[PDB]
Design an enzyme around this catalytic site. Structure first.
Site, PDB file in Angstrom:
ATOM      1  CG  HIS A  23      61.651  20.503  34.036  1.00  0.00           C
ATOM      2  ND1 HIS A  23      62.831  20.797  34.964  1.00  0.00           N
ATOM      3  CD2 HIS A  23      61.012  19.344  34.509  1.00  0.00           C
ATOM      4  CE1 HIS A  23      62.901  19.850  35.773  1.00  0.00           C
ATOM      5  NE2 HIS A  23      61.942  18.944  35.633  1.00  0.00           N
ATOM      6  N   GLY A  48      61.334  11.294  39.141  1.00  0.00           N
ATOM      7  CA  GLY A  48      60.320  11.923  39.755  1.00  0.00           C
ATOM      8  C   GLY A  48      60.484  12.938  41.161  1.00  0.00           C
ATOM      9  CB  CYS A 101      61.981  17.350  39.103  1.00  0.00           C
ATOM     10  SG  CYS A 101      63.254  16.789  37.895  1.00  0.00           S
TER      11      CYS A 101
END
Lengths: 305, 305
Positions: free
Chosen positions: B41, B143, B145
């Protein structure tokens, strides 16, 4: 979101851990530049521990009585000296992995990360608080002496603890990295015991702010108390008195949540007086006191290292 | 002595964390050999997240749409591909710090360490369990991820989790390192929610054995129950059924303490039926279920890495 007991990343400290052997005793050392730091009781025998004179015991040792191993590479000891309760072993090679570092002594109520080590090899990392009786509630088995506690600030490792011994209640005692003990403990066999402890009130309040930031609000109320009336109740529950400095330290958390400190204190007073009644706060059924205000801010905001 | 929520030392993983930027989105990547792994993503916009077709979105990207930074050194991307919900970015330099590693998928009830990262920089390490609803109760801010979860076995890092998203209850979901989600979650904007959860019974029993090993014995009793009658009570309290395999896994802890598993189960049954009555176990006022039997053995015996 979420709130966890979080340690600092340990990589910078892992690269400093070595194994120190003297006679039949093996423990952990901290290798920074061309110096290895370890507990001085590495030079003792079981008989020596009743009433050792470490000055005598050290003058009887040679550089070659000390085996230092950095993984496999043996380190040649070229000098030794005593710094209070730590030994400083001069080795002929500077540690190429030495981080930027400082030796700092911490205060009761402050937290730090512990890198638990065995035979010079890191095993686990966890977070600790220095209690008001100058013990820590660590997790240490035989061989863990010389494991160190630290904080990381930007890129600088602040070493604040080296492990020396376990007290008879299972709590732990050690020194700062200048070899000065936290609390009235000594590195010899005596009847010493941890003194009474109190709950770290400023940390409980910080943790309640963490709960509000994470959406636990059930314990809040419309009341406010004065500093004076709060302390009358908290001292009855074995809590540390709250000071105006503590109120000021909590200001940023007060601003982020819009809940005044003395308004949070009224919630704490009720939690102490009524208990939790089957509910939890941030996954705990008791009031947690080992998160500082800085811990809360760092975990509830993006701070990295 | 002592018992703490302990993470693995993170040094081996810290050396693999990088920052990946695509357009205006920045998250974390895992750099092993000449491949950087990150959540797919990273290629999405806010508009794309309602119903993205990642195959379409990726075919529209070039190697130069991906900025990879390893500290300061920029990494040149020389290929890209999709592996389920993770991107594999081929870079022109093998990571000199690549540890011995494996990609393993874990089971509900198992624990792992999480290295929480921001902009490619490690911030903290903590221990997690994969819940029976395939979520984890992590601590993640925006942030984070691409932060990974892992276990360390001897010298080998077993990567088992990469972080992708936060569910509306504040719990977290992600994939294994082959990009396959834990649980029925997807990397797009839907009404998805965590399902019901149960308490990990085998882990609670393990933790009670840790308590006995550490000298908490107040909850013990002279009674024993059958597997069948224990499960009738535990299922009434939202506990996972206990199996003969679970009894066998607990054997080593049973031998070390001399308390049979079904004897410990009778204590757990009473704790569930009566509560704790103002007392604590290993510093907790509730029954902890995020320590596996292996966690207990490793912390109550000298195992290192």
């Amino acid at each position: 979101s979420g709130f966890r007991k979080m340690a600092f990343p340990s990589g910078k400290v892992e690269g400093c851990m070595v194994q120190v052997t003297c006679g039949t005793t093996t423990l952990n050392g901290l290798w920074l530049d061309d110096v290895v730091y370890c507990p001085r009781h590495v030079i003792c025998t079981s008989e020596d521990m009743l009433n050792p004179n470490y000055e005598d015991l050290l003058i009887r040792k040679s550089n070659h009585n000390f085996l230092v191993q950095a993984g496999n590479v043996q380190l040649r000891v070229i000098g030794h000296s005593m710094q209070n309760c730590v030994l400083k072993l001069k080795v002929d090679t500077a540690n190429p992995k030495t981080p930027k570092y400082k030796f700092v002594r911490i205060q009761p109520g402050q937290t730090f990360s512990v890198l638990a080590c065995y035979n010079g090899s890191p095993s686990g990392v966890y977070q600790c608080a220095m209690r008001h009786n100058f013990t820590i509630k660590g997790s240490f088995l035989n061989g863990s002496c010389g494991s160190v506690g630290f904080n990381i600030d930007y890129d600088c490792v602040s070493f604040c603890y080296m492990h020396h011994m376990e007290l008879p209640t299972g709590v732990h005692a050690g020194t700062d990295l200048e070899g000065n003990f936290y609390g009235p403990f000594v590195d010899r066999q005596t009847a010493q015991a941890a003194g009474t402890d109190t709950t770290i009130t400023v940390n409980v309040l910080a943790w309640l702010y963490a709960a509000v930031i994470n959406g636990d609000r059930w314990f809040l109320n419309r009341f406010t108390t004065t500093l004076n009336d709060f302390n009358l109740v908290a001292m009855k529950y074995n809590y540390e008195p709250l000071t105006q400095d503590h109120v000021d330290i909590l200001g940023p958390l007060s601003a982020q949540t819009g809940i005044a400190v003395l308004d949070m204190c009224a919630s704490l007073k009720e939690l102490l007086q009524n208990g939790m009644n089957g509910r939890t706060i941030l996954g705990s059924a008791l009031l947690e006191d080992e998160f500082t205000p800085f811990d809360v801010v760092r975990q509830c905001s993006g701070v990295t290292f």
